[PDB]
Amino acid sequence: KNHPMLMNLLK
Amino acid sequence: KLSEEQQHIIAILLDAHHKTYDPTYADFRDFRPPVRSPLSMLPHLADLVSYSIQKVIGFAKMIPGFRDLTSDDQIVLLKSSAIEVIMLRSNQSFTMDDMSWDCGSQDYKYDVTDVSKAGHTLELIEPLIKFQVGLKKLNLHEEEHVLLMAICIVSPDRPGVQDAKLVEAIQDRLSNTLQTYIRCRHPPPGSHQLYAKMIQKLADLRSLNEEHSKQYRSLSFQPENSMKLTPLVLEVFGN
Ligand SMILES: C=C1[C@H](O)CC(=C/C=C2\CCC[C@]3(C)[C@@H]([C@H](C)[C@@H](CCCC)CC[C@H](OC)c4ccc(O)cc4)CC[C@@H]23)C[C@H]1O
Numbered sequence: 001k002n003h004p005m006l007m008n009l010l011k
Numbered sequence: 012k013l014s015e016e017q018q019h020i021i022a023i024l025l026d027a028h029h030k031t032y033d034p035t036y037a038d039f040r041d042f043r044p045p046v047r048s049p050l051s052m053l054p055h056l057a058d059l060v061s062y063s064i065q066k067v068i069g070f071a072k073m074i075p076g077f078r079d080l081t082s083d084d085q086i087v088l089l090k091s092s093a094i095e096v097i098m099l100r101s102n103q104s105f106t107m108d109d110m111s112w113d114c115g116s117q118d119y120k121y122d123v124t125d126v127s128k129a130g131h132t133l134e135l136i137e138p139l140i141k142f143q144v145g146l147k148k149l150n151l152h153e154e155e156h157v158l159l160m161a162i163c164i165v166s167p168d169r170p171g172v173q174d175a176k177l178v179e180a181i182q183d184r185l186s187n188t189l190q191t192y193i194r195c196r197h198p199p200p201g202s203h204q205l206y207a208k209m210i211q212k213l214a215d216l217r218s219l220n221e222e223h224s225k226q227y228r229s230l231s232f233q234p235e236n237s238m239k240l241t242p243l244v245l246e247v248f249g250n
Pocket residue numbers: 056057059060063097098100101102103104105112114121126129130131135136139219220222223226227230244
């Protein structure tokens with residue numbers, strides 16, 4: 001939520 | 012005694028670190044070049060930090076129970092801890108001989124002047140170097156090092172955490188593994204108060220992190236410096 005790059009590295 | 016689970020947790024953390032930390036430093040060749048002028052080392056060092064952020068996320072995903080957290084809790088834990096884990100993992104390249112981080116060449120050997128050339132003052136730099144020296148003098152086993160990195164990440168008191176109880180149960184398993192590890196595997200006299208000392212380093216990283224944020228905000232205030240960062244750094248540290 002406001003963090004697309006971090007979220008994608010998390011998945 | 013170290014249970015099978017405890018030993019399995021440790022085996023997993025070591026491998027995770029072995030997968031996310033390249034002691035050859037080969038990738039550094041891809042960064043913008045170091046230049047040794049205000050903020051001459053910032054592009055190179057901003058690339059080093061952003062690179063390191065990706066490695067820390069990779070490491071965090073491999074922590075037992077981390078994947079059980081919501082996407083939100085994972086993001087808030089990573090966002091507050093990133094800088095701290097980067098200070099921690101950096102201990103591997105730090106050398107006491109010259110008080111500098113040595114990554115295999117003169118070009119990738121970083122001292123206090125290099126850090127000042129990225130826009131930092133003695134206020135942050137002195138406590139950072141003192142931190143590296145104090146950690147270095149613990150002379151931790153690799154097992155201890157990787158446990159400390161995991162415990163640092165999964166701290167229930169980080170801002171924005173929703174499910175503190177779950178984060179805390181994750182950390183607790185990791186702390187107990189560390190405690191037992193020191194007792195069963197770390198011989199005296201090195202083991203003396205070792206757990207308490209490693210926990211005091213987590214307190215030191217938090218202060219350092221509080222300080223880092225103030226400096227980071229001052230840098231975020233001049234958008235021509237902020238321009239020199241990476242997208243991941245701006246996302247993770249904010250802008
Ligand atoms: C692969 C690795 C590790 O991940 C990281 C390595 C070295 C780490 C270093 C040595 C160089 C200086 C580094 C990068 C530090 C940087 C400058 C940080 C120091 C803050 C102290 C509380 C700050 C980084 C931060 O975002 C880029 C920043 C940068 C510029 C600012 O003006 C304000 C903040 C932290 C950690 C430091 C090499 C190697 O061991």
